[PDB]
A paper describes a structure:
The mesophilic combination of highly conserved residues involved in catalysis and substrate-enzyme interaction was restored in TsAI by the double mutation [name]/[name] (TsAID54G/[name]) that resulted in a two-fold increase in activity. Superposition of TsAI and its mutant form TsAID54G/[name] showed stability of the fold for these structures (the RMSD for the Cα atoms does not exceed 0.2 Å). The most significant difference between them was observed in the conformation of residues 51–57, where two substitutions occurred. The point mutation [name] led to the formation of a hydrogen bond between Q56 and S15 side chains in TsAID54G/[name]. At the same time, the [name] mutation destroyed the network of hydrogen bonds. Together, this led to a change in the conformation of this loop that was additionally fixed by the formation of a water-mediated hydrogen bond between the S55 and D62 side chains. Moreover, the part of this loop (residues 52 and 53) has no electron density, confirming the increased mobility of this region. Overall, the experimental data show that the increased flexibility of the loop M51-L57 due to mesophilic-like replacement [name]/[name] is the key structural difference between TsAI forms. The significance of loop mobility for TsAI enzymatic activity is confirmed by the two-fold increase in activity in the mutant form after disruption of “redundant” hydrogen bonds. On the other hand, TsAID54G/[name] exhibits a sharper temperature optimum curve and increased time-dependent loss of activity compared with the wild-type TsAI.
The hyperthermophilic L-ASNase from [name] (TsAI) was previously shown to exhibit high activity and thermostability and is promising for biotechnology. L-ASNase exerts its anticancer activity by hydrolyzing L-asparagine (L-Asn) in the bloodstream to L-aspartic acid and ammonia. The subunit of TsAI consists of two α/β domains: an N-terminal large domain (residues 1–184, consisting of twelve mixed β-sheets and four α-helices) and a C-terminal small domain (residues 207–331, consisting of three β-sheets and five α-helices) connected by an interdomain linker (residues 185–206). In the N-terminal domain, the active site pocket of TsAI includes residuesthat are highly conserved among all types of L-ASNases: Y22, S55, T56, T86, D87, K157, and T12, which initiates the reaction.
Residue numbers in the entry:
A (entry chain A), B (entry chain A): 1 to 51, 54 to 331
The structure:
């Protein structure tokens, strides 16, 4: 009946405790063996390893997108095991690089190595397999029995097993044993159009936390260092100091040439740069609101957008296009 | 019986909706009047305004600490109204600038202006007054009926009224009408020693989010721009790329001269740089773990520490000293 591909990429899920700490040591065949995954029953799993890796690099996104893209032809469902710390960047970036995928692409990981007592790895793989067997299409994350839209996922903690949340967006579904309870209607994830691959990206995006003290001298430094986009983890007021501070005036000097995106240091509820006068002053300088996007969506989307054009009005239109429900319309 | 001082500083709590957006317009006397606060019954409230402000600047911390410090002599309790976006930076910084305060110092704010329907401002002020009437000492935040240790508070969302959480640390208490339920024993917040004022700080700390793509060229740029400390919002693996990446090797070149602190982009559970080999490699470069500290504690503590010395071993010892339960021992 159904054919699944599981792609290994590294991560805690590929790791074992050593005398030098956790170390990425397992290929996907050993993960599947150590997590006691059934390779059949209404399906057949094939497995492959892309390329000691804990962390994804932007180059790896192009590699993974090409392999996933070629595989849509031969598989009903595609699972990617991945390090938790950068899984949400990968999930978001594939959501822009693979247009109209016509099969489920499901990323997962673990907080514990398989071989540690109480590991979450077997359960997360099993969840991902179950959802990958669904007649749906898009890029999803499977974690702690939840299915979440890839471009809306963030890692919220470093120890607790319920480590990924859907930010400012509903979960897709919840998997209890063999039952899938759709939180968003299944009919909403049907394939539309033919898949396309677009791997253009510019990686030199720098993300800053807006703090008291942060001066315009940083904006000078990041331009001197060659960076092409700036993400700010700003305030819910949505604005910057324009008094005892050159930050807003130094940004206003560069917004015609460099996209400056305003997201939040706060996790939940998004940025509204219109509610406060201080926000409206930040907008008036040409700072581009990230609205309800996650950090990981904001960042990967801007890298992808800069790969297409350096025209800041065109970047604004790309960032505010709702491609795959990464952002409100 | 008891004397309370309420200090105004600006914020949403001081704001009103105008045709140009929310605007800071109210002095503390008008806030108290519009929120219908009782200025007596077992107490007397005095009020004062420090110095159009939504956002605190590091300079304001010294001003507020001097005024709060002088006021310990004449008041049983001190309340500060403050903008929510930078309240947690202020609460943390006062926790290092005011040693062994012998009275409750309680910061609060609101998500809604007083004059907006359903405002949280009256309730937050009332909570802060109630806790300020307690025979305890330290720096606390009052929000949505909770009392939280100041140096453990973060703003987690931009719209929901329950906007502040206690991070990796229990709440101090919960206030239901006239009842205070102590979550940590009251006896644990008794005054010890005589209050001291220490307002030394270095503001040029830059906070970066660790992303895929982030190169060592940023470390060069921030040194050229004169910054004296770097906070990284890193990964739970606790490490950096040392492969297809010069980030870790450029940081290893500067850690003898510049403190580089590793905290998390994730909100909850802290950094453990020993669990993973990649973390141990980051430690071996002399990156200083922030452990369980909040971003706002990490950042203000480093600014305060740099105000005392530029010796990176002495900064490490300061950062890992548990002064006021900002960090685990």
């Amino acid at each position: 009946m159904k054919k699944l591909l599981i792609i290994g990429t590294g991560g805690t899920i590929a790791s074992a405790k050593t005398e030098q700490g956790y170390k990425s040591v397992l290929k996907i065949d050993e993960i599947l063996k150590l997590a006691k995954i059934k390779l059949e029953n209404g399906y057949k799993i094939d497995s492959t390893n892309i390329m000691g890796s804990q962390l994804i690099h932007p180059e790896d996104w192009e590699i993974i997108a090409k392999e996933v893209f070629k595989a849509l032809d031969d598989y009903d469902g595609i699972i990617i095991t991945h390090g938790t710390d950068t899984l949400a960047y990968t999930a978001s970036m594939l959501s822009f690089m693979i247009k109209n995928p016509n099969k489920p692409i499901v990323l997962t990981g673990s907080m514990l190595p398989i071989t540690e007592n109480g590991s979450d790895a077997p359960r997360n793989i099993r969840t991902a397999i179950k959802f990958a067997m669904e007649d749906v299409a898009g890029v999803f994350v499977a974690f702690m029995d939840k299915i979440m839209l890839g471009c809306r996922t963030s890692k919220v903690r470093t120890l607790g097993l319920n480590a990924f949340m859907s930010i400012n967006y509903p979960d897709v579904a919840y998997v209890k044993g063999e039952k899938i309870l759709y939180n968003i209607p299944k009919e909403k994830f049907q394939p539309n159009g033919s898949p396309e691959l677009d791997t253009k990206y510019e990686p030199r995006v720098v993300v800053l936390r807006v703090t008291p003290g942060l001066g315009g001298e940083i904006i000078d430094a990041v331009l001197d260092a060659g960076y092409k986009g700036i993400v700010l983890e700003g305030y819910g007021a949505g604005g910057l100091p324009y008094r005892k501070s050159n930050l807003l005036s130094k940004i206003k000097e560069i917004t015609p040439k460099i996209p400056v995106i305003m997201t939040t240091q706060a996790l939940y509820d998004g940025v509204d740069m219109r509610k406060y006068e201080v926000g409206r002053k930040a907008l008036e300088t040409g700072i581009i609101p990230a609205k309800d996007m996650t950090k990981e969506a904001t960042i990967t989307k801007l890298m992808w957008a800069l790969g297409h054009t350096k025209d800041v009005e065109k970047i604004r239109e790309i960032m505010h296009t709702n491609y795959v429900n990464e952002i409100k319309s």
